[PDB]
Structure formats: structure tokens, C-alpha cells
Symmetry: C3
Subunit: 270 residues, 3 copies
């Protein structure tokens, strides 16, 4: 029984409790849980009761609609730094696929490296640099089911160009155009923050922000045929020398995702 | 019982079926299996029947080429399938235990160098093994001080002489314009890199990128064997960093010819 | 039972045999064991008899009036231990009440002006394994033992560094003593020339296979760190004895511990 087989199982079990299968998925990053209250006529399933879900250390999965679209929302995610393997922490993404999800919207809190970023800003992700996945902790490592996806999937366009446009225009429409950027997300293992010398390397690599998640999730989602959009809340910013609110962030992010979902109801079921 | 001890056992078991111990080894990369048909008076042993060999279709071929007794791997093992670096490089330890002195490796890789074209050959002069720098080194673990150094030098992994033979053999076969000499960058896989990651790989000086070979030559070199590796540039990445059979079969024939001529030049030094 | 819990246990077991809890810790790198002979009225505990620990020995004793615990031998990721496992002794040091840790190692110099025999006081590090799947803090975190997301902005105490530099001057080694960036790799194979180039591009002055994960953990555990590398060899521009080193290093550490005792 492979991961995808287990994912199907998990899906089938969740399906028992659903009237409409989710077509849009959402993953809530650090402190961005409130986004979930946005789901209407929602059923909630604690991660602890979900079969095969990685042991937590109280996350929950929410099913409901937003602007007429059936969604599944993850309130809390899993990270490599907690001890999970890349495959393990990205198990929910395989489950999203097995549930029929076609678009996934992810959010996270990250450290800004780009000189023009300010704490509170939003960085729409246009590409990523996944360090762990280049060296021994790639979430697709292992046997591949040739009917679920490619053995060697392309990561040339992990972040859907169209979903990005919707995100940037939704930001403008909401009046946050000056605090909303588009850049490169660099994912590291964590949980210790980087030394100034490491931070310099990260800037040398062209990173606009750095965090400890998301990239492995979108590698798996993209491989699973799903479209991805990710937005980072720049929670803090690193000075030029390379060294180093929540409620407002939450509200703004929630509005942005909702508006994005609205524009998305043109490109998917119901 | 250490890996080297298991390698010796595996070798002793293969030896039972051999008249002449192989002195030269060959590892066939993706789509380069045909190279094996080049062995004369050959005995074939499926990987599945070989003791201690990882499972993955693959076979080990013993036979001669241009008067040289060789052992040829038709298929190899990669980190992305789920094997540890040590596990995927177990066949190299076996090669050593068999008495192999020279190993010729081939692989299919993506060209990053602006002047490479699909179909070209890149003789490997050096490598960049990302997984081995960060937590997935094939020598990680206890070291048999009688099998090799604890801290083996990797200053000359790719034998300068074997390279000359390869370059010259290419010229001699009329492929000098399609044959290069460059740096091979090894990554975990199985997902291809993002454009932002590809940029980093270029910034590191990579001429081509693939998901194998490097950990195998690290182990081979450590085991006192001499290495030669040739990459078939199956595809090329554009400057922005982003049927099929027609190409594969010609590549196979060219590569087979190159390897044979190289083995002939080698027969002058054993 | 978490690592921190096991560390406390191991500590409690060591403390049974101690009159004074160590306040300063020392980790001896490759060939730098002699530093341990510097401890007076010393109790010695082989690593093999220590509970939970992975011919290494732990030495308890005083130096210049300071009670210390000294590790004669360390653990490395290349031996097969996980980053957490190899950094277990650091958690033990914390549980023993250690406040300052002095680390030493042998390393390869990349900086053009370094020479074999020189000393490189560490001002910062580049921990490759820890950025990609082998971080020593990976796993659950005891919020009472340290931060979940600890800052690594100042791993190497600026003050301890000053003590080190001046102790070097005072000992007449100012010309062979530098201050630079230590790059930690997994090992055990040395890097290819092409990899060495990357390492220089990253701003590394020296490269070794230890220390960084240990200071990540010590720092997280609220301890102050000082690390000094013995530049055992140097890499040429193209990117390709021990007893004197031992004596010099031993003197430098002792003088630094003396300056530490007079602090506050």
C-alpha cells in the first residue's frame, strides 16, 4: 500500500461525511487560521481523528463553501522541522488530490529578505527554491505510481500564472497593492533561523523571502495535477546586514483569499 | 556485518558462476541498456536473484569486450526511488569486491551549458553532489579502514587519462563536435528543478544536471577504482532556465560505440 | 521521554559523582585531546559508561579556578548519528548547568591568507546539513527548554571572541590567529574542486564536518559559545606538527578560561 493508496483511503473515509466533494483547497499557515471561519455550512474534522494523517503535537480540516465554491481548508500544516519526512508532511496534499481538489491556495508566514518588503506585507509566490528537496529530503522521494503522476515531474511553473494575476489584482482591488509583492520563496529545513552568513547565501541565490514550508507541498500538488497559488505574510524583515499585528494580517489575508476564490469561480465546478 | 562484508558475500556468490573475474565495470544509465549487448560469451544474472542487491527489470551481465572481461549493470539505483545513498551505491562496493579496477558510468542528463544540444555527450570532468554535502552521503556510517580511507579525497574523482581516451575516442568516431567535457551536478530528484533552482545550479558552475552517478563515483573512488562517466544530454535548458525514440536509439548506438572504443584503448593498461 | 528528558537523566547520573557542577564546557576536536589534561582534581567518565551517550571520555575538573566538564572526542553526522543524536552531549552540558561552551576542531582553510597551523576563531557559520534535512533541532520542542524557532543571529558570543583574539595576541600568536566563517558539511568525503568553489562563493573561510550543529543546540539551550578551528591544512587557489598545535590550542583555551573567570 503506497502513499497514494493511503491517501485514497483517507479520502474515501472523509468522503463518507461529504455532500459535495471539495474542488478548491486551502492550507492555513502560521497564525492564518481565521481564514477557515470563512467556510459556510461547514463540517469540521480534527486531524487526530483522520486516518493516516501525520501525528500532530490542534489542527483540523474544514469542509464548506466560500463564494459558491466547495472547499476543504487545512487549519494548520506539517513541517519537516517537526520530524516528519518530506513525504509524510506532504501527505495532506495527496489527500487533497484524492478528494478531487483542482486548485490549492496556500499561505504561510515568512521572513522578508527583499529590501523593499516591510513587516505586514504580502508576497505572492512566483517561484521557489527548495533546499531540502535538492539534497536528501524531496517529498516525491520513493516509488512513483505512474498513473497518479510523472516519475520526473516538471517544476518549471509550480505557481499558476493566472492564479497569480488574480491574486495581485485582488490585492489592488482591496487597496493593498503597495504592500503586496510578487517574489521568490526560499524554503529551508528549520527550525533554527539562519545565521547572517547563511542569510547572505540565501540572498545570493535570489530569495525574496525565507520560510520552512510550502515548497514541498506545491511540488506534490503540482505533481498531482493541481494548480497552486501561495501567498506569504512577511511577518518580519531582515536588515541589509542579514540579521533580525497578527490580527490585522489575518483579516487582510482572509479578505484576499476570499476575493481570489471569487475570481476563481469562473475556472472550476459550481 | 558491514556493507563491505555483505558486498564481499554478494561477490563470492556471483563468482561461483564466473570463469574470469571482471576487471572493468559498466553502469548503464537511462535508455543506455543496449550497451550491454556488447558483451561476448555473456552470463546474465537478474538483480532480483542477487543476494543483498536492492530491489527496483535490472540485470548484471558478465562478458568480454575487445578482450576485456567486464561486468555490466543494466539499470542502476537512485536516491529518488527511496534508497539511501549507501544502499544505492551497494553495487559499486560489489564491483570492488569482484576485483573491478575501472568503472565506466553513463547517464541521461539535462544540459545547462549554452552550447550543449540534445543528443550531445558530456564527458564528466568533475561533479557537484548536493545530497552528499547535506545528509545523504554514500559513505556516511562506519568505515572499514582496510577497505578505504575514512576521509577519502575527491580531488580527482574522474581519471584524467580515462577522460583523454574518451575525448579521443569521440574524435575518432566523428563525434568531436557533439562531445563536451564538463561539470555534472547531482541532485536528489525526482522532481525537476524550478527555474529559480536552475539559476542557482548555473551559478554553481554546473554544465549538466542529473539524479545519479556522483554518489557512485564517490564510493568507487573510495574503493580504489578509477572512474569515467559520460552523460548523454537528453534535453537542454534554455537561457531563462526552463517520436522521442528517434533520438534514444541513435544515442544508444553512439554511446555503445564510444564505450567500446574506450574499452579498447584501456586494454593497453591493465 | 524527550531528548531533553534523557539529557536531564544523564546529567543527574553524572552529578552523583560531582562535588561542584561544571559551569564551563569544553569539546575537544580532532587531535586536540591534550586540552583535557589541563583539568585539575579530575574525575574521568568513559563515554561507554555514560547512559544515553552514543575511546571517548568526559572529564570533570577545574582550570584557573573554574569548574569545567571537557569532552575528549565528539560525535559527527558522518559516523551515522542523526544531528540530534550527535548533539545530545550539548543538551547534557546544559542539563549539567554549563553556561559557556568552548569548542575546538581541525578544519581545512579556504581563506587565501590562512596557513597550516593557524587558528581561526569562529565568528559565524554556514551549516549546510542543517538547512536541508539534518538540523539538530528537528523534532518536537520543549517550550520550557528553549524557543521553537531559535535565533541564530549571534551564535558566537562577541565577547568570548574578543577574549580569544586578545588571548592569542597575549600568547604571541596574533599573526597566526584569524577570525572567520566556518562552513559545516556532512562528510566524510572531502569536497570536489567544483564543490570547494561553491563553498568559496558562499563566503567560507574554513570547512569542517562538525561544530555548527553543536553550537546551534548550545545556543538554543541558552549557553554562550566560542569555537576555534585549527587550520590543519589549506586548499590552494584552484580549490584542491599536531603536537605543537595541541600545545598552542591548550594554552589559548586556558588563557581564555582565565579571562572568563574574571567576568561579570
Amino acid at each position: 500500500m503506497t502513499d497514494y493508496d493511503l491517501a485514497k483511503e483517507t479520502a474515501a473515509w472523509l468522503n463518507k461525511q461529504l455532500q459535495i466533494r471539495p474542488v478548491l483547497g486551502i492550507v492555513c499557515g502560521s497564525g492564518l487560521g481565521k481564514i477557515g471561519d470563512s467556510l459556510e455550512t461547514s463540517i469540521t474534522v480534527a486531524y487526530s481523528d483522520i486516518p493516516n494523517f501525520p501525528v500532530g503535537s490542534a489542527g483540523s480540516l474544514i469542509f464548506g463553501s466560500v463564494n459558491g465554491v466547495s472547499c476543504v481548508c487545512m487549519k494548520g500544516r506539517f513541517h519537516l522541522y517537526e520530524g516528519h519526512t518530506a513525504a509524510r508532511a506532504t501527505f495532506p496534499m495527496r489527500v487533497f488530490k484524492a478528494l478531487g481538489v483542482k486548485i490549492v491556495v496556500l499561505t504561510n508566514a515568512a521572513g522578508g529578505l527583499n529590501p523593499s518588503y516591510r513587516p505586514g506585507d504580502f508576497m505572492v509566490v512566483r517561484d521557489h527554491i527548495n533546499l531540502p528537496g535538492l539534497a536528501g529530503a524531496n517529498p516525491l522521494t520513493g516509488p512513483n505510481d505512474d498513473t497518479e503522476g510523472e516519475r520526473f515531474p516538471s517544476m518549471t511553473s509550480v505557481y499558476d500564472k493566472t492564479l497569480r494575476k488574480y491574486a495581485i489584482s485582488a490585492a489592488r482591488e482591496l487597496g493593498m497593492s503597495y504592500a503586496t509583492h510578487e517574489g521568490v520563496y526560499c524554503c529551508v529545513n528549520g527550525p533554527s533561523f539562519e545565521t547572517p552568513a547563511e542569510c547572505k547565501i540565501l540572498r545570493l541565490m535570489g530569495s525574496d523571502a525565507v520560510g520552512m514550508s510550502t515548497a514541498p507541498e506545491t511540488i506534490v500538488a503540482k505533481h498531482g495535477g493541481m494548480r497552486c497559488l501561495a501567498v506569504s505574510l512577511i511577518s518580519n524583515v531582515i536588515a541589509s546586514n542579514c540579521e533580525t499585528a497578527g490580527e490585522e494580517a489575518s483579516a487582510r489575508m482572509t479578505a484576499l483569499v476570499k476575493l481570489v476564490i471569487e475570481k476563481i469561480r469562473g475556472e472550476l465546478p459550481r
